[PDB]
């Protein structure tokens, strides 16, 4: 089969992964004790993708919960679905990273990175045919970005063949909760470019706006944002777990979208999302889902797709729909907005259809778009970084922690080069 | 700044193909890199062929530099550190895909490579030729006469430099002998002794020439003093006789 | 990347620094090698290439450049041409020396993108060569003393020749302003004889 | 004693074959578990207990669709060894299907196909079902066709492919794989009947009066066409044409072996009840340009050869009258060097109706297979969609890194640069 | 620079806390 190892670092990654495991456990009919209780034979036909079996007919997730501080970990341990994990997989430090890329990457992270490399190696040898790794983290933190980049590098030099799929919470300009975000983000992008095959860029501001306008929530806490990100994660790999007319796995999706090795920064999105009030009036139809796909407000990255041409698009549907409908929808979307799609790639959109809809739904859909405009999301960072680095602000921390000075210049240069790469194909 | 070379031209492009192929063939590329080359192959490039050509073409610049994985990044770093001026018009992704339309520039880039190689050889031998000068020309400076203190100082400096060069060569030979787990300074000692004997012979010849010149100058100085005394006496006598003749002519006329 | 086994052992940095300062260098300080940079490393290449065999970089660079730096042709890219030639020939001469001392993995990135490990290995090779050269100089200082004595004797001979020439050039006269010779004396004698004949004829007429 | 072997490469082929085997099992009266409550000898071989096992081989590089076959209503129809699966799909990669992933399953599929061919006494050909647009359907089909042409160079091989549509294609790298599979669908094939998804969508929207066509309807219609082709070996009739005479009738030149398919009457229920089907009108509808299966207009091309398989009770004189009527019509233009362009076979067993299907019971039907130059207009379309990618070497790095050499792209395109002329030089008159 | 190497060596003579060179076979041959 196709088994994916799931890794998450930092408080953000731990919480997002906890919500993801809760979502897909409810999808697969698994109680917190691990005993199956669903009423569908199709839930366990391929449950081994996420759940490893054990005696008593119990299923334990393939999760590698890692952090440098046992706080959020001990929060998730006592949670509603916290017992489901393997207690050996709970790996933890004692001194937090303190929002340092150097501490989470070089010194504090190194003492623990072997204790997670051995665990992930054991998990990968415990499965049949590894498809890839699934990583959840954030680029603005200290343990998140640094430890995620360290693990990314170690896996790539240890598992070059498999695929590297990661979900990164890129920092946003407006919603800021840290004064050293640009440094860590710039340092993390360096490793993400050259050591990952596809990365989904996520901003907290975009999720907040989606909760404000689409869902029309009053006070959207972190639970709602992590719920949305978990829904996107499950939608990406729904093709592996369930049958359908068209089946697209991670390698298929990558070869569809990724045109060049260094252009793998995708904007994710989900549909249909509606507030609980207007959720009885509108009727679900494929053209409406495809229209909601390309709405500039439904994006999960704080950047406007209208500012640059799309490179490629992937659409993963769920339900029972005639495929003429969806294929004509994509043709209409492409030709009506022909200035938003590049000219030297005909048929930018790749479609997949899964037969089993989400529980409590008749129809759903996930959008993954590789577009040039994402370069905007980078220049802003490369401004702030520079706007600090010219004055050598806050450097002494990293430098005394063990980071050479030239590394910051190299990271800024590579960020600029990737911005130029994306802008090059825009015109 | 923009690109002034007409890479988009057609006859120019064919001419570039021509001398690039001639240079590539005359260095036995097909045997040393075991890859056949044709005009058609350079017309339609490929990833492996372009990478191999660039690798061979750069190894002629820095033979001690070794390649590794991540070929595109290595090529970009090489292009940067070669002090290349037109790099702002190139991008990493274009390097990753040589064969596209951007190839209309990329092949010309290789051309400059070849040109440097050509320029390189005009430099290369001359470096040895420089040492060749130190082997011969300075010796000629030691075999020429001296007529001023500056010339003698220059000759002494040249002799000291030659002695230092001989000592450095002997030390290098001894170090090379000692590198291979051995202690055999006998050839180095013999070379140093031969160089010292040659320097001593040159110094003796120069000293003999200087002594002969000094003796000739002293003899000429004595002769010049005698001739100056005689000339002063003759000039005084001639002036007195001319004055007497002028006075007598004035009195008689 | 090229790599070879070295006969000399790996040596740590601090006594390397102090001995490099003691022997001939002054820029080989602790922080200079502790922080690898292009400019300092290439300058160190310069001081060593002027050290061990004692001819300047600029002379060699100009003497390899003049044929392309002059007016053979008007094409504009001559300056970048010559700059690339400069960096490549520096690479190439450094490669000659480093293969002469047992290093066959040295390259151009060593000049312009140095790192601690390879630079310190090169410095260990440098110090072993410097110590062996110092031992050779201590053994062959007799030749240096003989050369110094020969130079002193040559200087004394040159001073004697200059003094002799100055003494020779101390003779001058109205007839013979180019130092006295036989021709000036003969001309003066002929003029005096003619004047004396005229005076004698005048005296005989007036007798 | 005739036999026919059917091969199904994963995504399109497995589903098309599932529809085909539904249709065959209904045709021969067999129950869907294989027990039967002659004609079936071509497709189904019997055992001692009365069970009939089909001569089918199901292949894929991912096991999900086969697992649907392995657990659907036909899990007992197949012998569990012809259901062959891989571990990871080719993932739209031609090199993965052909070079890297395919070669670990190619040995098993050849072994099983040889085992199946051993039981055949007079095997006539291979009915290979695949798709030009994917990774498995291009690469693995190319590798399998190479192996078969090496091992079975005499027997005919028929490919029933799914050519990518001009506009509604569902893959970013589809032109690459479609161009790459041409070298192996050109020389190692006998009669590859092209099919486009867009044309069958249009046919379902117009003739069948349905605007929500899933893949099931297209698979059912393709199964109907292939059953109409193979009906000559299963039932008697006034005129029967086997695969060898079929090729000798259609294909005029070795490289001009890309026929164009059409079926009639593709009609709904109410229209069938109100209409009164006649041989002349179904024959004319076979020539209707919007009824073709490839999005090309036959008016722009000249028909090379045509064969008509009349299923159901039809009298030959009516067929001759319809042929004369078609020849009199000036919209259908043939080529000068082919005076007699119509070859006709008639079978006495009318088409079956699948319960829950969309095609009503018709006492008669007709399948048209026409070799013509109009199909050339299809090729050029992909020759555009290929170029706009290869002009920038867009996705080449995804194939070169899997075992492919970049030049093999251009060479494949070069083959089209020849093949077009093979539909153009012969298009010119003799003088 | 007029600082002659031979003259400087003679003046210095008339290891700087070191040793007279070394030669050891490398283990990782
Ligand atoms: C009767 C019915 O339709 O129930 C729905 C529902 O009413 C609607 C309106 C739901 C509802 O969603 C929301 O209002 C919402 C709230 C916060 C954040 C996002 C959405 C629902 O909450 C969403 C929830 O949907 C699911 O459970 C999905 O399958 C989803 N599951 C979870 O998120 C989940 C989390 C924890 C435990 C169990 C399930 C999912 C989707 C894709 C992949 C995996 C899981 C359910 C049942 C409903 C409500 C409760 C009203 C809608 O959302 C979803 C995600 O389907 C809003 O528009 C859709 C359409 C649905 O019809
Ligand atoms: N007519 C028809 N075509 C189908 C059907 N299923 C898939 N296809 C075709 O398959 C094409 C997409 O190819 P893929 O999804 O990559 O499947 P594949 O060709 O086997 O390649 P892989 O996914 O690597 O196995 C589409 O363009 C469809 O035309 C079907 O049921 N009927
Ligand atoms: N999307 C999302 N973002 C979060 C969540 N929690 C924290 N963040 C953001 O992630 C950034 C990094 O914070 P943190 O997780 O403490 O960094 P770490 O120490 O490296 O793990 C902060 O700026 C937060 O705004 C969460 O639950 N969801
Ligand atoms: Mg497939």
Author numbering:
A (entry chain D): 1 to 427
B (entry chain A): 113 to 365
C (entry chain B): 1 to 207
D (entry chain C): 1 to 37, 47 to 440
E (entry chain E): 254 to 267, 291 to 305
Extract from the study:
Kinetochores couple chromosomes to the mitotic spindle and transduce the energy of microtubule depolymerization to segregate the genome during cell division. Knl1c functions in the spindle-assembly checkpoint, whereas Ndc80c, a heterotetramer composed of the Ndc80, Nuf2, Spc24 and Spc25 subunits, is the major microtubule-binding component of the KMN network. Many fungi, including *S. cerevisiae*, utilize the ten-subunit Dam1 complex, which self-assembles into a large ring around microtubules, whereas most metazoans contain the Ska complex. Here we describe the cryo-electron microscopy (cryo-EM) structure of the budding yeast outer kinetochore Ndc80 and Dam1 ring complexes assembled onto microtubules.
Outer kinetochore – microtubule complexes were assembled on cryo-EM grids through step-wise addition of taxol-stabilized microtubule filaments, Ndc80c and Dam1c. Overall, the Ndc80c microtubule (MT)-binding domain forms a club-like structure comprising its two CH domains (**[Fig fig1], [Fig fig3]**). The underside of the club binds the α/β-tubulin interface along the lateral axis of the protofilament, whereas the coiled-coil shaft of Ndc80-Nuf2 projects outward at an angle approximately orthogonal to the CH domains. Two short segments from the C-terminus of Dam1 (Dam1^C-ter^) dock onto the Ndc80c^CH^ domains. One of these (residues 251 to 272) nestles in an amphipathic pocket at the base of the Ndc80-Nuf2 coiled-coils (**[Fig fig3]**), and another (residues 287 to 301) snakes around the back-face of the club (**[Fig fig3]**). A hydrophobic component of the Dam1^C-ter^:Ndc80c interface involves packing of Dam1 residues Ile258, Leu259, Ile262 against the CH domains of Ndc80-Nuf2 (**[Fig fig3], upper panel**). During error correction, residues embedded at the Dam1^C-ter^:Ndc80c^CH^ interface are phosphorylated by Aurora B kinase, specifically Dam1 Ser257, Ser265, and Ser292 **([Fig fig3]- lower panel, 3C-right panel)**. Ser257 is oriented towards an α-helix on Ndc80c heavily decorated with negatively charged residues (**[Fig fig3], lower panel**). Phosphorylation of Ser257 would be sterically and electrostatically incompatible with binding of Dam1^C-ter^ to Ndc80c^CH^, thus weakening co-assembly of the outer kinetochore.
